[PDB]
């Protein structure tokens, strides 16, 4: 194996952390770096390729794309860090008012038996004229911090998951003075932010996730065989990975009702496969459609972040003309895009007569 992914250990956290935001300069406009989503599955497409110099130039190619359910995230806080001879130090964080039950579930571990008493005194700090103290915290961030991040959480109760506990993370704000970033976050308080607002189509991003576990597995599969340098038996899988350069092909709006329709296929259909995503369900929200395979199982929490470095390739400056998106069943050898197509192909049936 590679001595660069060792100490081959299970990921310390299920969420997966960014570990590096792109470097910040004040000249760029104010923007957010990262976002969150849940892996729904993957499907097949056909792209009219414009790669000047390729043998598939001006030809139709079949590609595999991963679909990420991305309900809008909610901003609930703002954290400010300072530079010290020992690194970055979180000087202070100021939250939003009216936190949601899902983020309070994130804070609690046994939510059902608990008195749900989190951040009540903080809301009283807003309401009872301790807004002087809160403004003092904002001004401390303005006048002492060098980098600002925003606290944001996902919407499980829109995601088709049995879970009810949300996911918090800090998304770094770049491109402006610290005062501009503080005002931006304070204005973003108690507001939903969308994936088409953070990213857009044609843009390569980086995906942070925890790759699927397989338990105690021997050297044959753990490293790929026929001291730390010697292949040993142990945990294989469930590993934190940051996979780079994945092209954002589409962002579907969820309420469009024609997410899977292209300018070539005039079929009013959505991204969800016929019968639903296997083991996941239906995508009823904003979704991100990106090229290739991506670390993580279905319904796993995923972090989507901007590229650290300005790109060096023509694959990152290309437009993606889509021809069609596969919506056949993933539960077996499916050959119909819609139930209407299946009915038109197979005619009417005995149960159709019995019901009608």
């Amino acid at each position: 194996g590679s001595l660069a992914f060792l100490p081959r250990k299970r990921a310390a956290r299920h969420r997966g952390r960014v570990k590096s935001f792109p470097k910040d300069d004040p000249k760029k406009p104010v923007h957010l770096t990262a976002a969150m989503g849940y892996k729904a599955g993957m499907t097949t497409i056909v792209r009219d390729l414009d790669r000047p110099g390729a043998k598939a130039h001006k030809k139709e190619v079949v590609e595999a794309v991963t679909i990420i359910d991305c309900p809008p995230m909610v901003v609930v806080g703002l954290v400010g860090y300072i530079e010290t001879p020992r690194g970055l130090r979180s000087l202070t964080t100021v939250w939003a008012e009216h936190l949601s039950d899902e983020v309070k579930r994130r804070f609690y571990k046994n939510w059902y038996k608990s008195k749900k008493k989190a951040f009540t005194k903080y809301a009283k700090k807003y309401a009872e004229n301790n807004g002087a103290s809160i403004t003092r915290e904002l001004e401390r961030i303005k006048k002492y911090c060098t980098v600002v991040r925003v606290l944001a959480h996902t919407q499980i109760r829109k995601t088709p998951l049995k879970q009810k506990k949300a996911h918090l993370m800090e998304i770094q704000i770049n491109g402006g003075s610290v005062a501009d970033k503080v005002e931006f976050g304070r204005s973003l308080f108690e507001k939903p932010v969308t994936i088409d607002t953070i990213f857009e189509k044609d843009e390569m991003i980086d995906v942070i996730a925890v790759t699927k576990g397989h338990g105690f597995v021997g050297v044959t599969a753990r490293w790929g065989t026929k001291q730390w340098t010697v292949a040993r038996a142990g945990q294989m899988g469930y590993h934190h990975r940051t996979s780079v350069n994945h092209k954002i092909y589409r962002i579907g709006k969820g309420d469009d009702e024609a997410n899977a329709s292209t300018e070539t296929d005039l079929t009013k259909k959505k991204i969800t496969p016929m019968g639903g995503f296997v083991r996941y369900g239906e995508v009823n929200n904003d979704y991100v459609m990106i090229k290739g395979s991506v670390p993580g199982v279905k319904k796993r929490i995923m972090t989507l972040r901007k590229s650290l470095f300005t790109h060096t390739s023509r694959k990152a400056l290309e437009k993606v003309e889509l021809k069609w998106i596969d919506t056949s069943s993933e539960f077996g050898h499916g050959a119909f895009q819609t139930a209407a197509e299946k009915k038109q192909f197979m005619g009417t049936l005995k149960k159709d007569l019995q019901t009608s």
Partner: protein, 102 residues
Amino acid sequence: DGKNVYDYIDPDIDAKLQALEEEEERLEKEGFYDEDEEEEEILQKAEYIREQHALIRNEAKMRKSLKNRAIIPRKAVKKPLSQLEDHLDQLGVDTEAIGLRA
């Protein structure tokens, strides 16, 4: 919607389409699409018999056993007044007419 637009492309398609609506309108004018208690109750009675046949067959399989087990004869097991009364009642007989014999 699962069809090839190019396969349907045909110059001078208005004449063929108008012929299609004309022949349709004929089909309605003749009636090609014109859709057209004792039977219900006798079908229900047949369904009731079929249920009874299966419920007897299920009793048959319940006592049958798989491979040739010797069974104490009926003349040797004794059966209760309560059970004989219930079956003969379900069969529609006045049990109160006679039955102090046992």
